[PDB]
Subunit: 250 residues, 4 copies
Amino acid sequence: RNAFYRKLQNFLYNVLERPRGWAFIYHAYVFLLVFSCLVLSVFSTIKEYEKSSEGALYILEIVTIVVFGVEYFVRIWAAGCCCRYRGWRGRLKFARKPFCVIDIMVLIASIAVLASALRSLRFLQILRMIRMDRRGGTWKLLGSVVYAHSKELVTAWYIGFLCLILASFLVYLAEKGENDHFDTYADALWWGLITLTTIGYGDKYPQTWNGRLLAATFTLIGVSFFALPAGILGSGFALKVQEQHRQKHF
Amino acid sequence: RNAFYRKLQNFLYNVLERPRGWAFIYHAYVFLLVFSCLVLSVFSTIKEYEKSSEGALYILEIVTIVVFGVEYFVRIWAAGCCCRYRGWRGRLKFARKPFCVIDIMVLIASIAVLASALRSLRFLQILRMIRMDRRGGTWKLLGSVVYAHSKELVTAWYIGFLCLILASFLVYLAEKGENDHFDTYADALWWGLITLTTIGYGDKYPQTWNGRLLAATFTLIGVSFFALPAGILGSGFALKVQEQHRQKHF
Amino acid sequence: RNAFYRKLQNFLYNVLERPRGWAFIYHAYVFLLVFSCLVLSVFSTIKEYEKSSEGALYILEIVTIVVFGVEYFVRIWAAGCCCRYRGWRGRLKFARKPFCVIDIMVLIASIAVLASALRSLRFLQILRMIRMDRRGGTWKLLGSVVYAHSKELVTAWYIGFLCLILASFLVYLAEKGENDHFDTYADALWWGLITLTTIGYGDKYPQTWNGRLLAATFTLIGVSFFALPAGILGSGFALKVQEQHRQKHF
Amino acid sequence: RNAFYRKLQNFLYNVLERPRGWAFIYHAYVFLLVFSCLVLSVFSTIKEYEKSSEGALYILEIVTIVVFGVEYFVRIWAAGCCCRYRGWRGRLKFARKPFCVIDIMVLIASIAVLASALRSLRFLQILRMIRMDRRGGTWKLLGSVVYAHSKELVTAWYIGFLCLILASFLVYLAEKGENDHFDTYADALWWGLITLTTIGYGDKYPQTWNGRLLAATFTLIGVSFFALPAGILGSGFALKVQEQHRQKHF
Ligand SMILES: O=C(Nc1ccc(Cl)nc1)c1ccc(F)cc1
Ligand SMILES: O=C(Nc1ccc(Cl)nc1)c1ccc(F)cc1
Ligand SMILES: O=C(Nc1ccc(Cl)nc1)c1ccc(F)cc1
Ligand SMILES: O=C(Nc1ccc(Cl)nc1)c1ccc(F)cc1
């Protein structure tokens, strides 16, 4: 009973908090809730499919406030499951943390939402997605790998930037008179930035033997430069996972 | 004779089943059969080259039913080559497997095809390609590598998703009045999704100093994010092959 | 004298053949010769800059025949520098090799060129570039790495192909009536092939809530698939160089 | 006092020179200075936002000359902090170095700037960015990794070049009569170069069953080739960082 009380409350604290194998499905269903809320709002903006989504958004929005408020109250009530928190001093200081402050704030503000309307709704819908990473796991991992590869990321971005400036200047001089697309150094930088990242919208391209002959050399070099950090961080991630797996192997 | 009987039937079971060096050419020729069937159907849809491909499709389609039905009957008759199957109980339970059920089903349904016409033909032509992976080798390998890299794939897709939402919102506010392309948050999400994946169709691009100045920062960051998992899985594959080769080295 | 004779002839054989540090500059200058020949022909096709390049192409073309014929005669005369070739039997059998046959053939045919005109010139200009890899070093290395990664390349291309077929079919059904771009399954395959490779010409894009909602899921998945083998072979190359460097370290 | 003199002057030499943890913020603020100068010039070219940036560019330009001249004088005065330089002979020979020559030259020339106007300003603004890498760290690291991967970079670029030539020739023959886009071998090379790098502006695409059927094979092969070196250098960087970290681990 009361023994089941303590064991239950602890279990609740662990599912709501760090889950290992089974509570993750629960979190996945809450995430699918907020996700469909986001997609339905995106649908609800365009006035051709407006009336066919408002009512659904009302019901699902309230269901979001329901489940999040219930989660939060359990986040507080089930705080004394670890050694630290208990009574009112440990719980009080716990809510003083940054996450629980910002959480309770946004919860009340959401009630104000159901109380700059659609725009602020877009804002809150963005914010609820950040809730899905409580412990800051993704951010912490990304920052780790980026830091260890600081010098190589910087050489990739620095030399890529030099190549963008030089290529855009040269193609500017080559086609300024002949081509309408290039008229300012602003447009030559736009083309160069949207060509070395391999997007290539297609609205500005060299149209001169001088322009095409210059872009032909600088694409082969620059495109690789601007695609380096995707590869450096990719192989950084993969190597780190291999090392961690080895240490599991001991 | 009968000794050659057992040795033959076993050999048939191994070529039709897991081949090592020589039967793989046989499978490659059956695959080229179904492949040219698929390409010829793709040609046969456009009514300018219609009559010049129907007869070929008829002959080649029947040849497909011929060779697949013959393969399947040998798949059953040559099942008793391993220790398990023999007589009628091991063979019976073997056909109870999922693959042989779905195979025999689709074989009879194909006979019904030669008995929603062209559309269902497109459907079956898709399905026969899935037949080319009997043991589920490709799927099994891909699932292995993805699982071991679960945390890094999720951080790549999660942070990329945050960058897509924020960049699309900001560029929306920046160019909503000035640019026709952006009119709803649906179009800002479309541009953002088709720009950070570096496709860049070119139908929606920022056309404002505010828009271009915002997209210029967010491409440099986001494009890398959306191109991470290609690199993480790439180096995951390559590392796994190096480890397996080492263990061959012992 | 004659001692200098043998030492010279051997040296010639080594520079014309496998060079290590100093003859490579010589080969680089011959390559720049043929390269500028190729670029000048590309210029010479367009009839606005026709007369300003014909004479240069004549002089440089003959200089190419000069240096290549001289190289080839030394390739034969200096064959007896290793242990095998000497006199007339070793030299005779050496010219029987495939490379020297095709080389002498193309040399005489080039003289026939100076004796389907511009088109065949395009053909020969392509061929002379293949001459730049005598020992087949690049091809041999590429084939090595591809073979060791056979299984992962095949899973990347196979699953990417499945994703292309399924995505193109679905977007076809979604926008066939609404969008002009998609009219046949041939055009849906064209869009799908030119979208998952992240080229994105921009001439065919989904223009329907159903189309865009289907393409939005399948790009995130497929684009990674079609960009896998670039990454798998990239990390295969890099790993192989690290191993070879280690064995230099012993 | 004088002891504080020597300790100070040495400290100045180390912050202006190789900084470790704290002076790097100082350098970051000087870099943000020159960066905003570059962006403001890019704004100042377009005559719609001309008058709203000239005065800012004047003030910030002079501030650049102020801080750089002050840095340089301290670069000389604080040269005797290491063992070598002192008095007038070590300092004299130090300024004889290439960097300090080019630095003092560009400093005086900048004063001449405040004394081909806007174009030369674009030129100097480019040059000041190269100042941000004094020790040539980025260039040295990039050259290291490229050299160790010389053979694989060359096979990637060589075989990619062969694929570009062959694909452009074939698609030329396939669509020369039917498609306006392709009219010369120059345009077929332009399309091929701007398609295998996955830019895809969209101004030249095959529009013929023969053209599309040829491009469909060659994209799958070539696109990977032209995206190899980004991946090879990516995994080269990542591997080198793992080795260096291990040797820190000893
Ligand atoms: O938790 C919430 N937002 C949040 C924001 C930032 C961070 Cl860092 N963590 C969490 C939240 C809960 C219920 C609700 F209706 C709305 C928002
Ligand atoms: O085997 C066949 N389809 C299949 C489908 C799914 C799975 Cl998982 N395995 C196999 C098949 C054989 C002959 C034929 F005419 C048509 C289809
Ligand atoms: O060597 C030549 N072509 C070649 C072709 C294929 C292979 Cl595999 N190796 C070499 C060559 C030499 C002189 C010349 F004028 C024209 C061609
Ligand atoms: O140092 C400067 N330029 C430079 C150029 C090339 C190299 Cl390699 N190193 C440095 C510099 C200092 C003050 C100034 F107002 C303008 C330029």
